[PDB]
Symmetry: C3
Subunit: 372 residues, 3 copies
């Protein structure tokens, strides 16, 4: 995915690589207004140019930043959320200094975002990359996520996708409770310093208890998942600027909540216990009972969410949320095309088209971090 990965630097972005993008951005920004702000637009371009001339970089106005985060969301071709991009709360943390402070900002986010199940979308933007030596990073892939443990006999326990990170956490001093649903700690890096680990206050992590509307025994097999899907390891590019730390969140779809993960020895087990029900024939592969169980688990999940009043992207939600997004544009008194975000970028030997602003992937920090 190297195309969509924006890596680390060790020196500020050159003028010839910053100025053009800053200009394009500011034009894009001022081009959004129904009512033009000519005098302001020209003076801003001047301000920014002189600022890059004198300081070597530039700062975004809170309003420019807000716009950037929303546009980058609008420019996320995989995200169904891009549909209602105006429904985003932006938390400005560009004045942050330490991991201690990062944690507070992160807790505020979780708190705001969770809202007792009535999930709200938000993004916390930490200081932008300066020289690439003083980066702010969240080593975690997601704010909330279960630990994955490599058991002696070879089987995994917990989230199989977090094995490498869990190990890291252990190496960093985190005491592993060898359970199936252990919420991983936040590994926060501020000002390029070594990362610091913080346990996430249990009260802040809302979890959905799995139960089926028909099968009363469902709750007996003790399955649960966290309500907040928040990405922590991405980078926001905007007008040449780079924000290595800017975690955001949305809400689940329903059809994807991963553990029903039809994979290995993790899958098989939960799937057989199920057969206890209606299609009790788990002794043979003649009855494709697995199809029955999977379909039913999705039912238990969907049901669990709606009954525990935790927002999920069902058909009604998708439409209602989109309407709310349209109400915001109407009260403002046509949209700026997606085309207005495509920038021709000539990287080594090929003319390619890139979107900006945009949420890029990054290289896992421990792979590049230089220990103090």
């Amino acid at each position: 995915p190297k195309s969509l990965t924006r890596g680390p630097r060790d020196k500020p972005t050159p003028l010839e690589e910053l100025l053009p993008h800053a200009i394009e951005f500011i034009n894009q920004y001022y081009g959004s207004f129904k009512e033009a702000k000519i005098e302001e637009h020209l003076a801003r371009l001047e301000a920014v140019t002189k600022e890059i001339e004198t300081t070597g970089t530039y700062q975004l106005t809170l309003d420019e930043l807000i716009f950037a985060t929303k546009m980058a969301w609008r420019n996320a071709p995989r995200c169904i959320g891009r549909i209602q991009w105006s429904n985003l709360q932006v938390f400005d943390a560009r004045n942050c200094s330490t991991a201690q402070e990062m944690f507070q900002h992160i807790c505020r986010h979780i708190l705001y975002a969770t809202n007792n199940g009535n999930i709200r979308s938000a993004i916390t933007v930490f200081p932008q990359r300066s020289d690439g030596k003083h980066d702010f990073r969240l080593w975690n892939s997601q704010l909330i996520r279960y630990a994955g443990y490599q058991m002696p006999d070879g089987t995994i326990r917990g989230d199989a996708a977090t094995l490498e990170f869990t190990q890291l956490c252990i190496d960093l001093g985190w005491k592993p409770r060898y359970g199936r649903f252990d919420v991983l700690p936040l590994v926060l890096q501020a000002d390029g310093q070594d990362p610091e680990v913080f346990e996430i206050p249990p009260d802040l992590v809302l979890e959905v208890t799995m139960e089926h509307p028909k099968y009363e025994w469902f709750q007996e097999l003790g399955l649960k998942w966290y309500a907040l899907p928040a990405v922590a390891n991405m980078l926001l590019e905007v007008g040449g600027l780079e924000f290595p730390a800017c975690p955001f969140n949305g809400w689940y779809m329903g059809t994807e909540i991963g553990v029903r993960d039809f994979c290995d020895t993790q899958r098989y087990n939960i799937l057989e216990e199920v057969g206890r029900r209606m299609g009790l024939e788990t002794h043979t592969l003649a009855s494709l009972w697995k199809d029955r169980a999977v379909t039913e688990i999705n039912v238990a999940v969907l049901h669990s969410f709606q009954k525990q009043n935790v927002t999920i992207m069902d058909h009604h939600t998708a439409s209602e949320s989109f309407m709310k997004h349209m109400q915001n544009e109407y009260r403002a008194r046509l949209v700026p095309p997606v085309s207005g975000s495509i920038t021709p970028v000539f990287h080594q030997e090929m003319l390619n088209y890139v979107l900006s602003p945009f949420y890029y992937y990054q290289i896992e920090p421990w792979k590049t971090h230089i220990w103090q």
Copy 2:
């Protein structure tokens, strides 16, 4: 060409894969108007969202469809016709039910389109893809096209490009007349059912008799070609919707009418008979007589078309047709850029740019069709 091929499905398009595209389309549509229709635009987006919420899909207004077919034409980078996209007649057949009915619609098209040589561009849109199990398809590559037969000794007779399809037709019960210009039958598939074959009424197929302005013996070698170039196997994508059956037509260019196909034992023969003329030396390859003959055949073709008053895209035609297209826009009282059609699509692992609406290729039906 897998990039430009939109294949078969076996389940409706997911919400997260439909809604964004529907929205983008409706925005694109309402963005065309010189005079904005704010109240209507917002209510339409609402209507469609609620419709996808409740029905799982949506229907286009005839006017939206018309717009879609024209824009998709405008988005056909190979088609010189894209120059005058407003000159298109749209035949709505989204209410069609059987192959019997398809045939009637198809005959109407040919009739309208042929217009005794005064070729007119048209497109017949059949029902959109629902679950991918009830598809409408024209198994033919073109509405009108000559059969290709594999003779015992190995030589081919007729159109070499239609060998596989001709065989299919034979397998489907069509009696092969082993001639050089046998018009293939229409293999129509409706509502996902098995295809039904219909012979095309000879009166509907206009053919141009080949003759040279100077060589009176030209007509003696009995060469002819059909006047109507119509593609039958493409798919129209629009706002997430897919129309597997939507044949369209234009008119010939003159320089391409394929049989002068410098290929094998099919070519060589017609080319030698020619040498009977001005450069009678067909005993040696010292006189590049082939160049002489080819140039002359193109002359006979071009001449044949203009004398038999069958529209062909010559220099005058190109300009006149473009003017007619400009007269339509002027009477309406600036154009919406092509950029407004490019949509960033994140398919597996790569950020690519796609045009929409657009005419995609498809997989030959007999290769995927499940027999009843």
Copy 3:
């Protein structure tokens, strides 16, 4: 770089390959005006269509050409100059006939562009490609550039990048002075004829003498470079038209002026002589003295330029030049997006996106030229 290379032809561009592009261009052009020129726009499209119909090609109005050169500059993703695209002087030489005349036009350019160090950006556009058999070409890569000689013992003398071209010049009758800073002659090709070589009048080539602000011995090692960076071998594509000869110029950045070219036996030598200074230890690779010297050479260069008052793209220059570019747009009483230049081009088997107008690379002429 074959993607970005527009090669030679031997027959005019076909209608189906010209008309669409001409139309798109003219639309793009008339779409720039703050004040629409409806009557003029429509009549122009008509004019051009009829012109291509009758003549087989079309001529651009000087104003359309000016626009084309500026937009193509705006569409040069590597060029920091694209920032101030309105600051361009266009020299129309589409009426040029001979190499003699080309030379005069080229001398005027150098003269205007050099302006005693106060560098000004300009472009000289020679006759457009007709049938591809009567091309105007500058065989040189740059208007001004030092010769590169392959010495007997194997070492190179001068610009290592110009070895093949220098040889060509020698073959063409140019007497090689075997120095380090010999300005190469102009190899001009007009109307598809054989190229003619012209020595560039020394008075026209402004050179910067290298000296350090602190080290008085710097001037002693006699280093110099030319002030004018001008590309001579590119092709401008616009509305389907192709201009094989259209040299342009800008000014240096400072950080790139190549000879500090850390390469072979050319590098090493100048680098050691340096060590004579502050870090005199050139006997060992324990002291990374090379880093010291390189940094210092860049200092001598930058200093040499500013003291000899030869324009260079430093931070102040970048901002000041951009302001000058904004003053031009303000006095005209929002910009047309970059997206409005992207054209979907279906070349063999793939749907790609191209920019237009644009400055393409070309195949080195001597590799394709047919001698008379």
